[PDB]
Structures are given as structure tokens and as C-alpha cells.
Swiss-Prot record, chain A:
One of its GO terms (cellular component) is [Ni-Fe] hydrogenase complex. Transmembrane segments: none annotated. Binds 1 nickel ion per heterotetramer. It comes from the Archaea. The gene is hydA. Its EC number is 1.12.1.3. Belongs to the [NiFe]/[NiFeSe] hydrogenase large subunit family. Heterotetramer of alpha, beta, gamma and delta subunits. The nickel-containing alpha and delta subunits constitute the hydrogenase activity. The beta and gamma subunits (flavin-containing dimer) constitute the sulfur reductase activity. Optimum temperature is greater than 95 degrees Celsius for hydrogenase activity. Stable up to 100 degrees Celsius. Loses 50% of activity at 80 degrees Celsius after 21 hour incubation. PROSITE patterns: NI_HGENASE_L_2. This is Sulfhydrogenase 1 subunit alpha. Its main location: cytoplasm. GO terms for molecular function: ferredoxin hydrogenase activity; hydrogen dehydrogenase (NADP+) activity; nickel cation binding. It comes from Pyrococcus furiosus (strain ATCC 43587 / DSM 3638 / JCM 8422 / Vc1).
Swiss-Prot record, chain B:
Transmembrane segments: none annotated. This is Sulfhydrogenase 1 subunit delta. It catalyses: H2 + NADP(+) = NADPH + H(+). It comes from the Archaea. Optimum temperature is greater than 95 degrees Celsius for hydrogenase activity. Stable up to 100 degrees Celsius. Loses 50% of activity at 80 degrees Celsius after 21 hour incubation. The gene is hydD. It comes from Pyrococcus furiosus (strain ATCC 43587 / DSM 3638 / JCM 8422 / Vc1). Keywords: 3Fe-4S, 4Fe-4S, Cytoplasm, Iron, Iron-sulfur, Metal-binding, NADP, Nickel, Oxidoreductase. Belongs to the [NiFe]/[NiFeSe] hydrogenase small subunit family. InterPro entries: Hydrogenase_assoc-protein, NADH_UbQ_OxRdtase-like_20kDa, NADPH-dep_hydrogenase, NiFe_Hase_small_N_sf. Optimum pH is 8 for hydrogenase activity at >95 degrees Celsius. The keyword Metal-binding applies. Its main location: cytoplasm. It is found in: Cytoplasm.
UniProtKB/Swiss-Prot annotation, chain C:
One of its GO terms (cellular component) is cytoplasm. It comes from Pyrococcus furiosus (strain ATCC 43587 / DSM 3638 / JCM 8422 / Vc1). Binds 1 FAD per subunit. Binds 1 [2Fe-2S] cluster. It comes from the Archaea. The gene is hydG. This is Sulfhydrogenase 1 subunit gamma. It is found in: Cytoplasm.
Length: 420, 255, 292
């Protein structure tokens, strides 16, 4: 017959398209067409000055601009042999938590909520689900205001400089930020309940290899030096290309990734599965209560894991703000002298593991390698869409299209970071 | 009702995200009918008659040139949003040809999709109005949308970031630390964010049009503080990579 | 004029705007419309008087405000007229105004032609292009007060024959004007196929019916014609103390604060909204840069 094609996928970051190649024996082939243009960030930054090249890395995507900026700062500081102070690292973690809060709330409420609630746009949900949109806006505004205070803006933060910040806010602003996080914790609880009420489709049940970062310190977090797996093994961050293979498929501008010859998953659910025992507080209480839903076999648990991570990161940000306030006043930035080196930083983005490998030669970037969470997740996305489509084969085309789109949106895909 | 369509070229979706995160966008729904915006809407049709078209991103695919020609056919007003649509963005920082970058990034492999070097939307169609920034400010979107809703059009900006830097009382980084601030030649509207946070401007909003962007004077100021010609040219071409004025004006002062 | 509490509001705010309504719209040329206005406040409408040559600030709500000269006579009380050419944003919005719409006006501003000290002497008015409207105000004031002024002449010129301002009114007025000591001369410059007169105003100054030693001269138009008109007027014997011209610069307020309508040099620094727009011949002669 003819393939069932979605030319443009909506409520998904970036330009993409699914292609379900139908056949006699159910589904025959699934291609994830990535038509977002290549920007060659790994090549346009080569030979550019380090400080100027770091300012354009967050332009890969807007949903995780702070992720790119802070991972690039970590890579550059590792390359130049610089160690940030503890309070500066805490403030950077607060900024990253703001990015995670904004991205997760935005995803959950404006991209995977309307298709569960029977709409085609969150702008059509203003009169019926008023309270849900109100709490969505409050969480998004909290994340955006944290990023506005710490970084220069919510998108493409400029206050995050090499060795710290250009200007740090006053103490009262940090106290207000802590108070607003305390006020937003009940909103995180309501979000977790609302997304626990939803459904994990059984058509996509299968064994998943979950890769996540091992946190630095003794708490669930974002910065790490080791990458864990659901198979139990763990490898150093700098040795990522010994165990992860990047190959180019003839249907997308992105590089698919394989782990021991098999697709794998990174994201919030992988984070929960790998580092569940490191949770503390209301997050640990909620995880212990709802461990039945958070099985590392269904890709649709990712949304609930995102809600749980919002709940965790609000309290984590409160604690980090307390740690930073214990050392007031803070000098905004340390003098960094650019020696040659090679730094690989694997910080955990809102959508999975972000790998930044930067080599510095005479104050300039000579080698750039970026592997993004969506590039990690694309192969598993293809496999799970294949099983979903074979489960819903020969049905009405509209129902197959919407269910495949829901499966794709469960992975919170950022097509822009795939191509970088 | 004004029919508004937001279209995505090769972009980071920062401009669409900035428009989506505005609380005043809820006021646009009763006054304007959103036709094409795939980020928020799913019932959006690409080939439809729109009163005002907002285009985001650079032209880095042949399919994108076909799309922008179609948009110019289908729109009464075409507005270029962001530095990617206005001046090619940071993707046009490198002057290296497409095959070199392709070999460096993707190796010797085929994708079956045709890419091209980043170019502004104004190269392939006629953009009536521009919205500057990376991402553009919420105030820029508010002013543009409001003036379009009243039936007027936004006023183009021909004043530098230094105006808003001096209105806010920010210390001048170029006078104190000698940092390479591109503010004196960059369009205002950002309220001097980077100089207010102690950082130097990188010219995200773009260089002033109407031939009143003085790269030669700024290059002389940079040269007095110990910068080579190529450093100044790269700094100025970070976001102005499709500007023919920069090379000529800097080579004049370094000759 | 010096209207109190209506030019600066009881709130003492000089930027305060008055509500006016557009009653008649009339297309003079393609890029030209004549608007008839009245104030929605009846007392303000009956009390608002101006001077010939003064201008007003027309605030279209939400777009901006522009300075427009008043073309109707101040003795036509209750109503005033504005002639507006479509040059850009604000005027594009203005040209969409249909009768019965409400727009905001403050004024009058500047100094007009000194028509009070022109008593008992001839009038020569030289209008080029869009400068007909302030001279239309002066001409209609003279026609309403015919016993006060002697022989009057009105020279109106334009680039093309279709761009002549108030061609219908002045052509209809010519009869009984020739018998009423009024001469109307209308000429074109870039149209060699125009049936009527052709040439620049300096050619038609010799055809005037005014006594050169007792004539007040009011010139309005582009600044580039002023030098040639001055040469022609000086050659024919018109006294330099009686020659008056109008100048235009960028205006944002009209009260003297925004500093955009600046002319002159460090020796004589002046502002159009506060020292003009009507300037004397010796002011134009003394400081260069006021022309072009
Ligand atoms: C004393 C005086 C009398 C005038 N009388 C008339 C008249 O009778 N009829 C007529 O059609 N025009 C007249 N003008 C010109 C009129 O003000 C301009 O046409 C108008 O301001 C420009 O509108 P725009 O939409 O093109 O503005 P834009 O070109 O979009 O510019 C925006 C702003 O520029 C300023 N500006 C632009 N041109 C002028 C100008 N020439 N003078 C002052 N400010 C300007 C205004 O503040 C305006 O809001 C007069 C100007 C002055 C100074
Ligand atoms: N509204 C008022 O009361 C008032 C008062 C003062 C000033 N103004 C301003 O004056 C302008 C009015 O003129 P415009 O712009 O409409 O002019 P225009 O028609 O575009 O050009 C000037 C006209 O005057 C002719 N002309 C005659 N003698 C000339 C000379 N010596 N040098 C140059 N041209 C001469 C020109 O002939 P050529 O084409 O061959 O040059 C042309 O016909 C407007 O800017 C108006 O706002 C208005
Ligand atoms: N989360 C997340 Fe990103 Ni827009 C991906 N893939 C980069 O950090
Ligand atoms: S102009 Fe800036 S914010 Fe807008 S799409 Fe391009 S990179 Fe993103
Ligand atoms: S810091 Fe930059 S933008 Fe601010 S005044 Fe100085 S040069 Fe201008
Ligand atoms: S200061 Fe320069 S780089 Fe910073 S936001 Fe403003 S225009 Fe953009
Ligand atoms: S118009 Fe503002 S100073 Fe005259
Ligand atoms: Mg890569």
C-alpha cells in the first residue's frame, strides 16, 4: 500500500517526521526523518576563541540552553585545569535546576498533557483545565525567574562566564528565590499526582538498557564523572567513545547511538532507575510509594519520572541556596588562565546525558564533540515506535499517527540538539 | 481577526519559545487567529493564507528555500524573527565551505537530504519587517504584535545598545577593563543585559542598518587596546557573518 | 494664541490632548486629504482660536503624533481644517480616518505670520507644494478681513498639475477675485503639457498687483526655492524687512523640550516650535544652514 507519514510532528521541539513503512507482515520499517538543518556547531567553533566559542554553544537549543552553557563551562574548566569554588558550583547547580524545572514543566504541561486531555493545543485549554494551566505557568515562571536571576535570561544565559558569574545577585534576591521554591513545592506535588493518574500503554513493554550519570557526592544530582547502566557496569566519563558508537543513518541529520550493539535510553526514567537510592525527602517518599509505575521497561514512565524529578529538584535547589548563603559574600568570578588541555564533561540534561568533549590549544578550540540526549534516544525511539506500530497495525491511520506521536513525545525529543 | 503563522526553519526554537512563554500571549488568542504554529498547535496547516507570517531560523536546507518562497507567496506581511532569520545567526560564523564542514562533522556518509550554508531569509524572499535578538526580547514581540494589531508597523531601531546602557547607569566595560564590547554598533532593545551583568556585548541583535554602523571607529578603539585584526573581525562577525561592511571597514583601519 | 487652561489643561500638563472629531474628508491630490475637525467639547470648540501659520499636534491613538499646520481661517469659529500628506506610518494611519472618528489634538503652537502688524498694506503669498495650507490660512484670513489689507496676490505652484493644492477652490475663486483686488496665479514646473501656466514663482512675481514698497511677503514651501525667490523679490524692490518664510524640522513635542527642531549655529541657536516656524528674511540671511 502506502506508508503512513507524518510530515511535521507537532508539540515537539525541532522539525521532524515519522515514516511508518507498511507491509504484509504488520509494520516493515520505521524511519525517523530529521529534516532540521545541520548547523555544524562541532565545526564552526573549531579555531575560535574559547570565551567567544562558549557563548554560542547554548544556541543548539532553547529548552536546554543552560545545560549546554554549564556543560561547556565544565568542559572548558577541565581543559584549562581550573577548579570552581564550592559556592560558585552550588549557584551553577541552582541555575541548572532552574533549566530542568522549566524544561520539565513545559514538556509535561504543554506537550504531553493536551494529547492526553483530548485537545490539539494548550492554547485551546484555557477555560476547561484552568488550574492545570495556572500551575503550569507558575512552575515555568519559577524556572524562568531562577534563570533570569542567575543567568542573564531564560534562553541563552550570558551571566555564566568562565570561572563563575559576571555579576551575582544580592542576598535578598536569593532569599526570595528560596521562598518561591518553598511555595512551588506543593505545585510539584500536584503535578506528580496528575501525571500518576495517566496511563502507561502496555504495547511498548520491553527490556530497556538505561544509561545515566553517576552523581558526584552522595545525592541525586546532575554533575558526575561516571556513567552507569541498567546492566550494572560503569565507565569513566572521558572514556565514553570506547563504549558508545555514533553512526550516521541515511534518513536523518542526527547520529544514532548504540551501546554494546543495542539501542539504549537516557532521560528522567533512566535517572530514576539508576540513581533511585540517592533520592532524599518527599522525592524518596513519592518514589517508594509509586515504585510500581516507575518500572524501567515502559518508555511512558518518563513523564512521571520528570514530575518526580521536579519534586526532588525544588528541595535540592533550596538546600543548595542554603549552602551558598552560608558563605556570603561571594566573589562573582575567578581569574582563569587558559592552558592547553582536553576536558570531557557529562552533565545530566533534562532529557538525558549530555557529553561535551572540548580540546583547547592556545586559548582556542581545536576539537569539539557533542553528543546530546536525543541523539542517544533516537535508536530506542525507532525500536519502540516499531513495536507500537506493529501492535496497532492495520488500524485507523489517525489513531496510529496520534499514538505514535505520543510514543515519540514520551521521549521529550529535542530535534535541534540531535543535529547540533 | 488577524491570521498569524509562525514557521520554523533551521533554528533552536528560541524565538518561538520566547513567544510561547509570554503571559500576554493569552491576550493574542481573542484578537488573532493562529494558523500555523506547530510547537503549540497540531491542527496547523503549512499551506494556508496568513495575514502576517513570522519566520524563525536560517535557510540551511533546499526544502527551506522552497518553504520560504511558499511563505512569501502566501503572506501579506513577512516578518523575520531573530538573528538566524535576519542575519544568518551564529551558524554563519564560519566562512568555510559546506563540504569541509560536512566531512568534519558527519564523515563520509550520505543522508539523502540536501543542506546548504546558513543564509538569512532576506536572500531568498523579501522580508517587510525584522525582529532583532537571539532570542528577541519580550518587549520587541509585544511592540511588533501590538503595532500589527492596530494596523501600523514597528519602527526600525538605528541606535546602539550604549543608549540603554547609559540610561540604566551600567559601568562601561570598554572604558574600564578594555573588553571587546560590540555594543556601540549593535541595535538596542535588550536593555543592555550583558553590560549590566558585567559581560561584553557579542552583538546578538545585529549591527545597525542604514550604513550607520561604524566598524572602523570601533576597530580603531579595539586596536588602541591591543587586539589583532583577525580577532576584531571574528568578534564582529560572530552574529554579523553575512555583513559585507565589516571586512572592508576593518581592513581600512588596519591598512 | 495664548488660550489659558485649554492649551495646558487644568492638570497643568502641556502634553494633554483634546478630543476632536473628523466631519469631512476630501481628497485634494492622490497623496493629500483635507480634514475638517471640531472639538467634542462645545465650550472648547467655541473658545479655540489660533493664528494663521500656527500648527497643531495630531495624535492618532496608539501610533503617534505629528505636527500639522492649520489651513482654515481662525474666524471660521467652531471648526478648523488640516491638510495631510501620506508620508509614512502616522500619516498612513491618518489617511484611513472616515468621518465621525475621534482623534486627539493639542495646540496651537509656535508663532504665526504677523498679520496684525500687516494692517493697511499689500499681501503677496508665494506657496510651493505643501506650503499652500498655511498660506491658505493667511489667504482666508485676508479674505475674511478684506477691508484691513490692500491688494493681495496668491501664487501657488507645484511639480505637476494634479498635485496643485486647492486647485478647485482657487480656480472657482478667481472670478470676483480679479474684481475684488485679488490675483491668483497657479503654475506648474515639471509638466510641459499642462494647459495652464508654467514656470517658477520668481517668474510670476513681476505679474503681481502689489505695491513693492508696501507689501508683506509670505513664502512657504521647500527651503531650496527660498534663495531664488529672495533674489527675485529683492530685485523688484520688495523691502527685506517685510519678507517672511516658514521652515520645517523634525518635531516630537512642539513645546520646546524634545530638542529635535533645532536650527542655526552657536551664534544664533533657535528652535522651530518656540522661535518659529515663521522666520524673517534677515534671520535667514544672517545664519547659513537654515536653508537646506
Ligand atoms: C510646522 C510644521 C507644519 C507642517 N504642516 C504640515 C501640513 O500642513 N501638512 C502635511 O501634510 N504635513 C505637514 N507637516 C509635516 C508632517 O509633520 C509630516 O508629514 C509628518 O510628521 C510625518 O509623518 P510620517 O507618518 O511620515 O512619520 P514618519 O516618517 O514615520 O516619522 C515619525 C515621526 O517623524 C516626525 N516627522 C517626520 N517628518 C516630519 C516633519 N516634516 N516635521 C516634523 N516632524 C516630522 C514626526 O514626529 C513623526 O511622528 C508639517 C511639519 C511641520 C514641522
Ligand atoms: N504646510 C505649510 O504651510 C508649509 C510651510 C513651510 C514648509 N512646508 C514644507 O514645504 C514643502 C512643500 O514643497 P514640496 O515638498 O511639495 O515640493 P515639490 O513640489 O516636491 O518640489 C518643489 C516645487 O517647487 C518648484 N520650484 C520653484 N522654484 C524652485 C526653486 N528655486 N528651487 C526648487 N524648486 C523650485 C519645483 O520645481 P522643480 O520640480 O523643477 O524643482 C517644484 O514644483 C513640504 O516639505 C512642506 O511640508 C510646508
Ligand atoms: N535536556 C536536554 Fe538537550 Ni535541548 C537534548 N537532547 C541538551 O542538553
Ligand atoms: S535567532 Fe537565536 S533564539 Fe532565534 S532561533 Fe536563531 S539562535 Fe535561536
Ligand atoms: S559597556 Fe558596552 S554597551 Fe555599555 S556603554 Fe560601554 S561599550 Fe556601550
Ligand atoms: S548586550 Fe549584546 S549580546 Fe547581550 S543581549 Fe544585548 S545585544 Fe545581545
Ligand atoms: S518639537 Fe520638541 S523642541 Fe520643538
Ligand atoms: Mg555530535
Amino acid at each position: 500500500y502506502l506508508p503512513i507519514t507524518i510530515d511535521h510532528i507537532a508539540r515537539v521541539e525541532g522539525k521532524g517526521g515519522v515514516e511508518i513503512i507498511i507491509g504484509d507482515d504488520g509494520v516493515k520499517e520505521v524511519k525517523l526523518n530529521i529534516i532540521e538543518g545541520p548547523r555544524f556547531f562541532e565545526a564552526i567553533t573549531i579555531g575560535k576563541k574559547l570565551e567567544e566559542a562558549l557563548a554560542i554553544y547554548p544556541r543548539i537549543c532553547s529548552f536546554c540552553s543552560a545545560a549546554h552553557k554549564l556543560t561547556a563551562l565544565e568542559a572548558a574548566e577541565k581543559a584549562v585545569g581550573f577548579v570552581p569554588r564550592e559556592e560558585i558550583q552550588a549557584l551553577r547547580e541552582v541555575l541548572y535546576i532552574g533549566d530542568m524545572i522549566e524544561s520539565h514543566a513545559l514538556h509535561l504541561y504543554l506537550l504531553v498533557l493536551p494529547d492526553y486531555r483530548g485537545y490539539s493545543s494548550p492554547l485551546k485549554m484555557v477555560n476547561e483545565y484552568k488550574r492545570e494551566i495556572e500551575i503550569a505557568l507558575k512552575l515555568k515562571n519559577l524556572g524562568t525567574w531562577m534563570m533570569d536571576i542567575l543567568g542573564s535570561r531564560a534562553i541563552h544565559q550570558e551571566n555564566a562566564v568562565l570561572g563563575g558569574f559576571g555579576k551575582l545577585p544580592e542576598k535578598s534576591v536569593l532569599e526570595k528565590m528560596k521562598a518561591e521554591l518553598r511555595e512551588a513545592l506543593p505545585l510539584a506535588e500536584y503535578t506528580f499526582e496528575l501525571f500518576a493518574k495517566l496511563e502507561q500503554y502496555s504495547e511498548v513493554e520491553g527490556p530497556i538498557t538505561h544509561l545515566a550519570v553517576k552523581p558526584r557526592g552522595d545525592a541525586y544530582g546532575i554533575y558526575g564523572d561516571y556513567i552507569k547502566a541498567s546492566d550494572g557496569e560503569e565507565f569513566p566519563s572521558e572514556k565514553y567513545r570506547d563504549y558508545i558508537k555514533e553512526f550516521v543513518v541515511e534518513h536523518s541529520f542526527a547520529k544514532h547511538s548504540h551501546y554494546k550493539g543495542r539501542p539504549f535510553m537516557v532521560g528522567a526514567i533512566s535517572r530514576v532507575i539508576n540513581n533511585a537510592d540517592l533520592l532524599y525527602g518527599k522525592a524518596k517518599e513519592l518514589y517508594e510509594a509509586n515504585k510500581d509505575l516507575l518500572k524501567g521497561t515502559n518508555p511512558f514512565a518518563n513523564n512521571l519520572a520528570q514530575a518526580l524529578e521536579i519534586v526532588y529538584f525544588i528541595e535540592r535547589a533550596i538546600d543548595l541556596l542554603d549552602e551558598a548563603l552560608a558563605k556570603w559574600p561571594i566573589k562573582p568570578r575567578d581569574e582563569v588562565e587558559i592552558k592547553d588541555g582536553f576536558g570531557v564533561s557529562t552533565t545530566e540534561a533534562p532529557r538525558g546525558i549530555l557529553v561535551y568533549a572540548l580540546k583547547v590549544e592556545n586559548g582556542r578550540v581545536s576539537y569539539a564533540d557533542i553528543i546530546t540526549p536525543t541523539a542517544f534516544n533516537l535508536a530506542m525511539m525507532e525500536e519502540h515506535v516499531r513495536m507500537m506500530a506493529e501492535k496497532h497495525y492495520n488500524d485507523d491511520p489517525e489513531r496510529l499517527k496520534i499514538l505514535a506521536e505520543m510514543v515519540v513525545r514520551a521521549y521529550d525529543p529535542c530535534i535541534s540538539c540531535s543535529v547540533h | 481577526k488577524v491570521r498569524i503563522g509562525f514557521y520554523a526553519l533551521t533554528s533552536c526554537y528560541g524565538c518561538q519559545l520566547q513567544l510561547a512563554m509570554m503571559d500576554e500571549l493569552l491576550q493574542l488568542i481573542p484578537n488573532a487567529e493562529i494558523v500555523c504554529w506547530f510547537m503549540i498547535d497540531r491542527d496547523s496547516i503549512e499551506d494556508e493564507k496568513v495575514d502576517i507570517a513570522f519566520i524563525e531560523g536560517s535557510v540551511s536546507t533546499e526544502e527551506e528555500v522552497e518553504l520560504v518562497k511558499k511563505i512569501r507567496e502566501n503572506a501579506k506581511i513577512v516578518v523575520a524573527v531573530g538573528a538566524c532569520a535576519v542575519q544568518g545567526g551564529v551558524q554563519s560564523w564560519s566562512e568555510k565551505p559546506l563540504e569541509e564542514l560536512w566531512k568534519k562533522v558527519y564523515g563520509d556518509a550520505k543522508v539523502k537530504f540536501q543542506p546548504k550554508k546558513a543564509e538569512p531569509v532576506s536572500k531568498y524572499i523579501k522580508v517587510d519587517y525584522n525582529i532583532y535578538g537571539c532570542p528577541p526580547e519580550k518587549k520587541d514581540f509585544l511592540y511588533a504584535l501590538g503595532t500589527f494589531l492596530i494596523g501600523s508597523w514597528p519602527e526600525d531601531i538605528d541606535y546602539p545598545v550604549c543608549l540603554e546602557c547609559r540610561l540604566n547607569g551600567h559601568p562601561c566595560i570598554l572604558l574600564e577593563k578594555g573588553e571587546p564590547c560590540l555594543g556601540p554598533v549593535t541595535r538596542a532593545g535588550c536593555n543592555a543585559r550583558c553590560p549590566g551583568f558585567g559581560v561584553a556585548c557579542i552583538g546578538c541583535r545585529g549591527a545597525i542598518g542604514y550604513d550607520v554602523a561604524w566598524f572602523d571607529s570601533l576597530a580603531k578603539v579595539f586596536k588602541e587596546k591591543g587586539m589583532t585584526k583577525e580577532e576584531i573581525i571574528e568578534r564582529m562577525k560572530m552574529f554579523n557573518g553575512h555583513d559585507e561592511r565589516v571586512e572592508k571597514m576593518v581592513e581600512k583601519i588596519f591598512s | 494664541m495664548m488660550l489659558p487652561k485649554e492649551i495646558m489643561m487644568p492638570n497643568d500638563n502641556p502634553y494633554a490632548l483634546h478630543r476632536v472629531k473628523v466631519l469631512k474628508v476630501y481628497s485634494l491630490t492622490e497623496t493629500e486629504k483635507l480634514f475638517l475637525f471640531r472639538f467634542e467639547d462645545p465650550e472648547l470648540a467655541e473658545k479655540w482660536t489660533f493664528k494663521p501659520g500656527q500648527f497643531v499636534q495630531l495624535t492618532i491613538p496608539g501610533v503617534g503624533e505629528v505636527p500639522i499646520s492649520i489651513c482654515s481661517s481662525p474666524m471660521r469659529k467652531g471648526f478648523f481644517e488640516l491638510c495631510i500628506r501620506k508620508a509614512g506610518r502616522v500619516t498612513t494611519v491618518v489617511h484611513r480616518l472616515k468621518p465621525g472618528d475621534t482623534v486627539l489634538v493639542r495646540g496651537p503652537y509656535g508663532n504665526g505670520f504677523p498679520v496684525d502688524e500687516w494692517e493697511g498694506m499689500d499681501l503677496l503669498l508665494i506657496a510651493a507644494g505643501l506650503g499652500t495650507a498655511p498660506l491658505r490660512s493667511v489667504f482666508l484670513y485676508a479674505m475674511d478681513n478684506r477691508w484691513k489689507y490692500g491688494n493681495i496676490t496668491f501664487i501657488n505652484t507645484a511639480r505637476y498639475g494634479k498635485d496643485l493644492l486647492f486647485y478647485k477652490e482657487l480656480e472657482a475663486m478667481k472670478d470676483l477675485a480679479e474684481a475684488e483686488n485679488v490675483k491668483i496665479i497657479q503654475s506648474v514646473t515639471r509638466d510641459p503639457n499642462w494647459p495652464g501656466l508654467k514656470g517658477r514663482p520668481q517668474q510670476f512675481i513681476v505679474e503681481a498687483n502689489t505695491n513693492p514698497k508696501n507689501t508683506a511677503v509670505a513664502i512657504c514651501g521647500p527651503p531650496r526655492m527660498y534663495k531664488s525667490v529672495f533674489e527675485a523679490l529683492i530685485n523688484y524692490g520688495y523691502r527685506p524687512e517685510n519678507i517672511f518664510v516658514t521652515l520645517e524640522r523634525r518635531m516630537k513635542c512642539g513645546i520646546g523640550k524634545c530638542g529635535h527642531c533645532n536650527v542655526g549655529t552657536s551664534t544664533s541657536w533657535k528652535y522651530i516650535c518656540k522661535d518659529g516656524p515663521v522666520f524673517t528674511y534677515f534671520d535667514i540671511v544672517s545664519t547659513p544652514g537654515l536653508l537646506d
